């Protein structure tokens, strides 16, 4: 499932916002 | 709402000419706890000695932000902050600098992260969505009535309150902008699709976010999702996107408008602007004035026990405030 696949990866943690 | 409007541009209008400075001291607060950190500078639960109020103050070295280059995107944080009023954005209170950091002083939000909610919770229904998205949608039109474009619209920042309302924080890249803008800023999984391909934008940025948003809340994860960047850029742009199978039939649609790739067809950047959107099917049942007011049944509260309680907020690690007996970047910060 889309929901198993999102926990299972690298980004569902607090995001960081990119500057350079 | 216009007339509203245009009685609250003129006074921040008044701000933003005159900001204010220095209205307090280190000094008059007790550091008590770090309720979230940043790239250049933390935030701490803090007490002010002479009140006995609680409140979060936000840290920034200011040689950090030289390094990263971040200066004008500072000063336009605090005029910014300093000049709005709005039911749905945090006060700062105070702000101060030293030789070593810059302060913001700000009101203490005791219910936490939308985020950690979320993640706790798994995904949020569309009502409770809604209710959510909603208030995004009143301080959009509020915020791009001033020519201020937000930018990093996040669960991340933003903060639920005793009522069950939010409260958007962080404004490092708002900026306000008649015209189009080129900074590349934000975050990945929130990109519209102009700023990753580098063609200069304006407000639509902040309405396709918006559509990231309530996406992320209603499904429990964001539309577009890989383990890097360049991943996520890739789907962002490919002009795709698959909804869950639970998302109501007024809820795919509502997103296909504010996911609109094409910029002169999305949502919130047409003709009738924001009415596109406070008129749409999905928020038929939406009361927008008795939103404004708070006069709504927040579905869900978040409880603290007892003021200064930081139980909703997570553990960091506490590194000690350091200032240095010379001043570091007069010149670059004077107006702060
Ligand atoms: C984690 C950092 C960065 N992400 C948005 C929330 N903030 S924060 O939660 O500290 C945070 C930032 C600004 C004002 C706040 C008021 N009350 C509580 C918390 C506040």
């Known amino acids: 499932t889309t929901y198993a696949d999102f926990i299972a990866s690298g980004r569902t943690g607090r995001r960081n916002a990119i500057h350079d | ?336």
């Not at chain 2, 918006?210 to 890739?234: C, K, N, R, S, T």
């Not at chain 2, 742009?237 to 002169?264: A, C, I, M, Y």
């Not at chain 2, 003021?307 to 000690?320: H, L, M, Q, R, V």
Request: charged fraction near 25%; aromatic fraction near 14%; charge should be neutral.
């Open chain 2, 1 to 336: 709402v216009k007339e509203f409007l245009a009685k609250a541009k003129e006074d921040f209008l008044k701000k933003w000419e005159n900001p204010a400075q220095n209205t307090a001291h280190l000094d008059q607060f007790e550091r008590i706890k770090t309720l979230g950190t940043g790239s250049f500078g933390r935030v701490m639960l803090v007490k002010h000695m002479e009140t006995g109020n609680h409140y979060a103050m936000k840290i920034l070295d200011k040689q950090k932000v030289v390094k990263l280059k971040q200066i004008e995107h500072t000063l336009n944080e605090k005029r910014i902050l300093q000049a709005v009023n709005f039911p749905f954005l945090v006060k700062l209170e105070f702000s101060f600098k030293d030789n070593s950091n810059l302060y913001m002083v700000m009101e203490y939000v005791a219910g936490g992260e939308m985020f950690s909610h979320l993640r706790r919770i798994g995904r949020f229904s569309e009502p409770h969505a809604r209710f959510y998205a909603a208030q995004i949608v009143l301080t959009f039109e509020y915020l791009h009535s001033l020519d201020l474009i937000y930018r990093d619209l996040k669960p991340e920042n933003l903060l639920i309150d005793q009522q069950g309302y939010i409260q958007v924080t962080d404004f490092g890249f708002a900026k306000r902008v008649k015209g189009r803008t080129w900074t590349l800023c934000g975050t990945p999984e929130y990109l519209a699709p102009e700023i990753i391909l580098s063609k200069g934008y304006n407000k639509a940025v902040d309405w396709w976010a918006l559509g990231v948003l309530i996406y992320e809340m209603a499904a429990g994860y964001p539309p577009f999702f890989a383990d890097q960047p360049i991943q996520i850029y890739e789907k962002i742009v490919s002009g795709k996107v698959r909804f869950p199978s639970h998302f109501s039939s007024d809820l795919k649609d509502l997103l296909r408008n504010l996911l609109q790739v094409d910029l002169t067809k999305r949502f919130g950047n047409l003709k009738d602007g924001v009415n596109d959107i406070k008129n749409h099917k999905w928020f038929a049942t939406t009361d927008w004035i008795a939103i404004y007011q708070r006069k709504v049944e927040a579905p869900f509260i978040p409880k603290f026990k007892g003021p200064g309680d930081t139980s909703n907020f997570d553990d960091y690690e506490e590194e000690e405030i350091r200032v240095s007996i010379n001043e570091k970047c007069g010149k670059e910060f004077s107006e702060f």
